[PDB]
Amino acid sequence: GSHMLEMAGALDASQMSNLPPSTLNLSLTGVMAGDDDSRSIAIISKDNEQFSRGVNEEVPGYNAKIVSIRPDRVVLQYQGRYEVLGLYSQEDSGSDGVPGAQVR
């Protein structure tokens, strides 16, 4: 077939994908999956500003597009690639935004 361009890769690269590609950053506090991608709420924390994202939404702050919602895992489209990012942090929530030695 030439009138239908599929090109589904060649092999399951994600089978060996134990290392989160894309970018890895943020804190994906957690999603609230909605049927699946048919809705999907993504409560992501960006230096701890939680937003409601989802499939075909992008992560707060950076254009990491949530092409697939999972609890705190997201197959996201960033940098022309959509890979498996479980953006997770606690260093974002544990900060006032003032880089120093003695904030407290």
**What's the distance, CA 68 to chain centroid?**
8
Q: What is the dihedral of CA 8, 13, 15, 16, to 10 degrees?
A: 180
Rounded Cα distance between 21 and 67, Å, is: 14
Q: Are 43 and 33 in contact (CB under 8 A)?
A: no
Backbone φ and ψ of 15, nearest 5°: -60, -35
Rounded Cα distance between 26 and 64, Å, is: 10
Closest residue by Cα to residue 64 from 21, 4, 12: 21
Closest residue by Cα to residue 72 from 39, 50, 94: 50
Q: Which CATH number belongs to the domain containing residue 49 in this structure?
A: 2.30.30.830
The tokens describing 69, both together, are: 């919602």
Bridge-partner residues for 32, per DSSP? Answer: 41
DSSP 3-state assignment of 92? coil
The tokens describing 59, both together, are: 């992560």
The domain of 66 spans 21-88
Those residues whose C-beta lies under 8 Å from the C-beta of residue 79, and which sit 6 or more positions away, are: 22, 23
The tokens describing 43, both together, are: 């409560």
Method of determination is: NMR
